[PDB]
Amino acid sequence: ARLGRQALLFPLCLVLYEFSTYIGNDMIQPGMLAVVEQYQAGIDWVPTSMTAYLAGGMFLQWLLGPLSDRIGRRPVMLAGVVWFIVTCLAILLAQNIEQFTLLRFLQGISLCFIGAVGYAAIQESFEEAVCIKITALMANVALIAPLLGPLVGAAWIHVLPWEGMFVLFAALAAISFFGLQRAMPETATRIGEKLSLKELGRDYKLVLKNGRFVAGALALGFVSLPLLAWTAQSPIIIITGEQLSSYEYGLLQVPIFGALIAGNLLLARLTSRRTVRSLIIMGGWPIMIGLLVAAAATVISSHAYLWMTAGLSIYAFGIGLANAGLVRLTLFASDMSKGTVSAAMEMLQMLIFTVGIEISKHAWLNGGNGLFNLFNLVNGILWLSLMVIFLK
Ligand SMILES: CCCCCCCCCCCC[N+](C)(C)[O-]
Ligand SMILES: CCCCCCCCCCCC[N+](C)(C)[O-]
Ligand SMILES: [Pr+3]
Ligand SMILES: [Pr+3]
């Protein structure tokens, strides 16, 4: 007795899995101060938790897409959910911060299953119209998690051990596993076919030769890096840096990620009467001004964290308005397999995130908020520079 009611259970559980992998990063960052204290490791390992998680997030997309096409979307997706559960529980037995960070990398591999197999099964399963609605819900979850995560995460370590968070991630994932086991269809259309790694290597070499595709893909990385660098480092900037509490830390997340949502909501309204190109130029203004204000203010006054938050909120508003559009143009900048293009642009932007967060970390360690913000400004200029070519 399962076909109508169990039709929308499949996207629902994939959304739940997407949610748990995202708070798997976003809840952990505030709780990371407790982790650092419990291992007696330096504060420099706080953003490295995210770096490793995102490094794992770019490790397998290239393989998982065409592999799940040959052996099945079901077994590969269920293997990803299981892997997440297992590595979530496995981090409880970590004996030092290096082992913690290593399992943080292994946990992040679970991200690769969302786009390359999960969402591919969505495209293959539903009509164009219904697929749009699921994609919309997936985008909403991506907006809520970086806001709810630091808030719940900061409140969590006030009462419960950080170990408990990973039990929560695995429990949520276990719910999604049983749901995906029952409701996910098999939609792989190349089952039985052999997979050629040499032939797959030729495909990725081909998209990287597309100059216009790479410019847009790097631009998505550079432009979102400030936001990710804030996510990675706000616990150490606010609590250990500014000598503030969890309350301030969490409160400052609201205007920033709230502006992100506001910029996406305005994007939804203006989408019928604006081209993707003009929305990028539209968002370009608050992106540049926001980053400029954050930089200038913390250079003249190192502890002007409210001005920093204000600048990042203005910038975040610009990202909400301009990001989805640039994703769209980058996807269509290469006339090649969507799975390959998606994986390539996911891989490229997460290379910039991982490298950039680590540079960002050293920037703040050596020069405080001024240098943290100046590096963010450079990333904006790099996005802006790529846009003058990508658009003109
Ligand atoms: C508009 C933001 C672009 C970031 C790309 C999304 C990467 C998902 C990785 C999960 C980490 C969550 N986070 C920090 C991005 O909110
Ligand atoms: C936030 C949900 C993600 C799954 C569906 C939307 C992604 C389709 C395009 C893939 C490339 C986009 N990006 C930002 C990951 O590079
Ligand atoms: Pr070929
Ligand atoms: Pr091919």
Author numbering: 9 to 400
What does the paper say about this structure?
A principal mechanism underpinning the unabated multidrug resistance is mediated by integral membrane proteins known as multidrug transporters. The majority of the known multidrug transporters utilize the inwardly directed H+ electrochemical gradient to expel drugs through cellular membranes. In sharp contrast to MdfA, which cannot extrude short dicationic compounds such as the neurotoxicant methyl viologen (MV), I239T/G354E can export both monocationic and short dicationic drugs, besides other well-known MdfA substrates. To answer these questions, we report the crystal structures of I239T/G354E in complexes with LDAO, MV and DXC, determined at resolutions up to 2.2 Å.
The best diffracting crystals of I239T/G354E were obtained in the presence of LDAO at pH 8. The resulting structure was determined to 2.2 Å resolution by combining molecular replacement and single wavelength anomalous dispersion (SAD) phasing. Overall, the LDAO-bound structure of I239T/G354E is similar to that of Q131R, which could be superimposed onto each other to yield a rms deviation of 1.0 Å for 390 common Cα atoms. This similarity suggested that our structure captures the transporter in an inward- or cytoplasm-facing state, and that the respective mutation gave rise to no global structural change even though I239T/G354E or Q131R reportedly altered the transport function. Perhaps unexpectedly, the density-modified SAD maps revealed two continuous, unbranched non-protein electron density features within I239T/G354E, indicating two bound LDAO molecules, denoted LDAO1 and LDAO2. LDAO1, similar to that seen in the LDAO-bound Q131R structure, is seated halfway into the lipid bilayer, at roughly equal distance between the extracellular and intracellular surfaces of the membrane. LDAO2, by contrast, is situated between LDAO1 and the cytoplasm-membrane interface, ~6 Å from the latter and appreciably more solvent-accessible than LDAO1. The closest approach of LDAO1 and LDAO2 exceeds 5 Å, implying that they interact with the transporter independently. Apparently, the addition of the side chain carboxylate of G354E, rather than substantial protein structural change, enables I239T/G354E to interact with a second LDAO molecule.
